Paper text:
Here we show that in addition to small-molecule antibiotics, Streptomyces produce and secrete antibacterial protein complexes that feature a large, degenerate repeat-containing polymorphic toxin protein. A cryo-electron microscopy structure of these particles reveals an extended stalk topped by a ringed crown comprising the toxin repeats scaffolding five lectin-tipped spokes, which led us to name them umbrella particles. Streptomyces coelicolor encodes three umbrella particles with distinct toxin and lectin composition. Each contains an amino-terminal twin arginine translocation (TAT) signal, two sets of four ALF repeats (ALF1–ALF8), two extended coiled-coil domains, and variable C-terminal and toxin domains.
Using single-particle cryo-EM, we obtained a structure of the Umb1 complex at an overall resolution of 4.3 Å. Our maps enabled unambiguous placement of UmbC1 into the Umb1 particle. Although the entirety of the UmbC1 ring was clearly resolved at the centre of the umbrella crown, the density gradually decreased in quality towards the distal portion of its stalk. The C-terminal toxin and HINT domains of UmbC1, which, based on our model, would localize to the tip of the stalk, were therefore also not resolved in our map. Given that our map is derived from >350,000 individual Umb1 particles, we assumed that the UmbA portion of each spoke is effectively an ensemble of the four UmbA proteins in a stoichiometry consistent with their representation in our sample. We therefore elected to model UmbA1 at each spoke position because of the following reasons: UmbA1 is the cognate UmbA for the Umb1 particle; our purification of Umb1 particles on the basis of epitope-tagged UmbA1 ensured that UmbA1 populates at least one spoke in each particle imaged; UmbA1 is typical of Umb1-associated UmbA proteins in that it contains a single lectin domain (unlike UmbA4); and UmbA1 is accommodated well within our maps at each spoke position. The interaction of the UmbA trypsin-like domain with UmbB1 placed the lectin domains of UmbA proteins at the distal ends of the Umb1 spokes. At this location, the domains are readily accessible to ligands, an arrangement compatible with a role in target cell receptor engagement. The structure confirmed that UmbC ALF1 and ALF5 do not bind UmbB1. Notably, it also revealed that ALF6 is not bound by UmbB1, producing a particle with five spokes rather than six.
Author numbering:
A (entry chain I): 30 to 287, 292 to 297, 307 to 323, 332 to 351, 356 to 369, 371 to 385, 395 to 405, 408 to 417, ...
B (entry chain H): 42 to 165
Amino acid sequence: TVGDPTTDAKLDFTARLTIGTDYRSCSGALVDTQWVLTAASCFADDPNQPDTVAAGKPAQLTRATVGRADSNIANGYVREVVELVPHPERDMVLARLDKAIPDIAPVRLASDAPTAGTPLTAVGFGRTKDEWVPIQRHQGAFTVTSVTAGAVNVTGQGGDAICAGDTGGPLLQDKNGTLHLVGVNNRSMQGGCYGSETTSTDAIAAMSDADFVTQTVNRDLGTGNLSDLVASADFNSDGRTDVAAVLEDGSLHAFYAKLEYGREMVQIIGGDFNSDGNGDILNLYTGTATGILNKSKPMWHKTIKQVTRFKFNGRGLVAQWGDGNLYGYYTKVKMWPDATWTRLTGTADINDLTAVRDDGSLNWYAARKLWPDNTWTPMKRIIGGDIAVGGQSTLLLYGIAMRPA
Amino acid sequence: EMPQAVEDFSYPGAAKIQAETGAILKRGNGHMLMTSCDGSEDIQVMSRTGQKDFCFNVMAKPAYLTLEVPQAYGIWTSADPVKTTIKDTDGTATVINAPANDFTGYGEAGSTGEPTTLIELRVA
């Protein structure tokens, strides 16, 4: 990367990493305060065959400095790498740091590929035309020549080739001040470099992968100590009922059914109450096309024990009152002739309202026995036709572990 | 097919230098460059082989470069102490600490008269 030096706070999300004392060195960039994205080849015995770069601890002590645009000053943060998470298909790895850097923001990821003719920029700590190792990081300019299967081909504009030490460095495309990561540099012709010569300025970079990062960075949102506030609804317009749950951070997170993790109160109930096509969550939080809930509003103008979802005439709630009676609400109807209600659960298309008795027996109302054994005593907040938080607070589907471990 | 853009700390252009100056270079921390001797002298090495002499420039401190120069006899320093490792013909290595802004010699033009080889040049 041969161009002007830059120390401005536009590209301070970049990083430089070294492996061992003098074994290997390459570039990278932040995707989170705890995570840095680089190439997998940096950790390979043979960088041209990054197949043996397994997940786990680095083979050699690996360290990275973040935001240190100028190597002659102490500005920036220094962190150690503890774990690596390689991409299953291409030359890309996520590095987990021992400690976070909350002061430096990550770079946003691109939603799609750049096309041929698109003006891209790149920044890194690699070699220059006249220096083996630079003092400051430099920014160059490249154009897209073509797009291939999971990668983007670029060329230098007016020279400025990708050289050496640029591996793992970001490819960026900005719009209206917003920077998105479009790919990661892997290989290059290295023309116009100190100590070598070739005419070509061509280079290839791995295509940015938002899902790879999302399911790694947020890999551990759940599986730990979660609240009992769980509900089901279609939150991604997929036709598959998803699951939302509240974590220790007090926020509601959506996990999508295929459970994969998304990006973004005594009892919680969902469902498409207004038939808007976007699942909702006594105040109603309406769903939107982006999967984000809007500001809630009262559903009405305190002696109820349990409330669960129930579909009435295609659209609803059922409330179990402290007097043992169960009523449905749209206008209300009696769900059962007498006060015979028992743990109330949500509904499911078994052939239907599920329920759990104090003796551990599971049944459903059109009651009829739903489970051969009587082991549902400790089960709470059972949600919906497939259908409990479990004794370990891990949601099971009937009991398959829908959540990762 | 394109090579990986990974820094291996191998001196850039070392292959061409061997052909042109006769000196060979291997690994370093990248903060020392081989340059010409023309009013830009920093650390200068004199020998009786290759193209007689050549100069190096320090980009940052600390710095080192494990270059090899047969039959060396003299070194110039400037604005910095220089730690030099040389080796005898019997394989034994020793270290000479040269003062800043002065001139010192090696075996051949030193105390032993031995035709020693430069193994490592290190910047304080």
